[PDB]
Design a protein around this ligand. Structure first.
Ligand SMILES: Nc1ncnc2c1ncn2[C@@H]1O[C@H](COP(=O)(O)OP(=O)(O)O)[C@@H](O)[C@H]1O
Ligand SMILES: N#CCc1c[nH]c2cc(Cl)c(Br)cc12
Length: 327
């Protein structure tokens, strides 16, 4: 069958921590007062929650309330435990309270509000320097959650909240996050389609923190090349074909061979044969202002099929692409 895999960093974090740290099912939830929050307006409804702008009437501060839908409040203790474990960490969203919603009768997570700069505005106007600056801020959040034994599993631009005036960034939406335990087989139905790593697309379940580094590389590629999304698959199968048209099919088959993966036979008629493209093939007059040899080298080190070969978050922080960022 498939060959096992382990992370090359933070392998022992959850064994050295007490069981209370990762055994989320044993966690007793400390319920707050739902009356402390007045809902103001609905911000959105995803597959798992309804999100509201609200006011914490005990300090008149803006908060965000995520009311879990019936279907998947089941995995609430996992999200609560992760948010409580990461609280106060660099650029991690702060969970302010946990209350029982009087209407849904489900848990409602209360978060610190971020006066987020409009998404399109960020994509369209962040400069080369700002991309480097904010990528460095995301890396601080990812190295912190990985060092704490957690993988985010849904890194994508809509999960990264930037208040551009205050040069503030927060990593949000921890509903898919999981504790990393070496040798554990995880569900591959995580991350958004365009940010899914090859390990998910080839159905390799023994993945780790490095999935987040692939997702981060997709974000960076879309930003610097002005191509949203960078890998534009029509579905999960075509997503792998879009990746292979850039990274090549030979390194894909070497990856499959190394881990002894059984590739879905559906791929035999659609993968074709492709040679890796040099990153300069994506440069043009409209993205030249965002591209540099250092950005391309950095990107090349994130976007690798072999999950064990990608830069870790802490190694990425050392890269020359960040030498210009004020520290
Ligand atoms: N702390 C926050 N401050 C401001 N807006 C937030 C906050 N948390 C979530 N949102 C907004 O609420 C919606 C739901 O967020 P969530 O479901 O947690 O993540 P996402 O929808 O980005 O995957 C999004 O539209 C997001 O912009
Ligand atoms: N894509 C896009 C826009 C955007 C949203 N959230 C981000 C976080 C970072 Cl780190 C960067 Br760089 C860009 C974005």
């Amino acid at each position: 069958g498939p060959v096992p895999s382990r992370a090359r960093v933070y392998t022992d974090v959850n064994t050295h921590r007490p069981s209370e740290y990762w055994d989320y099912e044993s966690h007793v939830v400390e319920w707050g007062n739902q009356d402390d929050y007045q809902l103001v307006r609905k911000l959105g409804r995803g597959k798992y929650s309804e999100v509201f702008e609200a006011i914490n009437i005990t300090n008149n501060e803006k908060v965000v309330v995520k009311i879990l839908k019936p279907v998947a409040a089941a995995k609430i203790k996992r999200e609560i435990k992760i948010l409580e474990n990461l609280r106060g960490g660099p650029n991690i969203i702060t969970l302010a309270d946990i209350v029982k919603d009087p209407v849904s009768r489900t848990p409602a997570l209360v978060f610190e509000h971020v006066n987020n700069t409009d998404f399109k505005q960020l994509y369209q106007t962040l400069t080369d320097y700002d991309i480097r600056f904010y990528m460095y801020e995301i890396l601080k959040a990812l190295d912190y959650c990985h060092s704490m034994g957690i993988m985010h599993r849904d890194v994508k631009p809509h999960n990264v909240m930037i208040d551009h005036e205050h040069r503030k960034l927060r990593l949000i939406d921890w509903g898919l996050a999981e504790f990393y335990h070496p040798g554990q087989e995880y569900n591959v139905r995580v991350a958004s389609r365009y940010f899914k790593g090859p390990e998910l697309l080839v159905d390799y379940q023994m993945y780790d923190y490095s999935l987040d580094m692939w997702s981060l590389g997709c974000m960076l590629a879309s930003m610097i090349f002005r191509k949203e999304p960078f890998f534009h698959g029509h579905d999960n199968y075509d997503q792998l074909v879009r990746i292979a048209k850039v990274l090549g099919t030979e390194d894909l088959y070497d990856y499959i061979d190394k881990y002894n993966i059984e590739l879905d036979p559906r791929f035999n008629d659609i993968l074709g044969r492709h040679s890796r493209k040099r990153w300069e093939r994506f440069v043009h007059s409209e993205n030249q202002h965002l591209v540099s040899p250092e950005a391309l080298d950095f990107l090349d080190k994130l976007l690798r099929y072999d999950h064990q070969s990608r830069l870790t978050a802490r190694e990425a922080m050392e890269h020359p692409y960040f030498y210009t960022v004020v520290k």
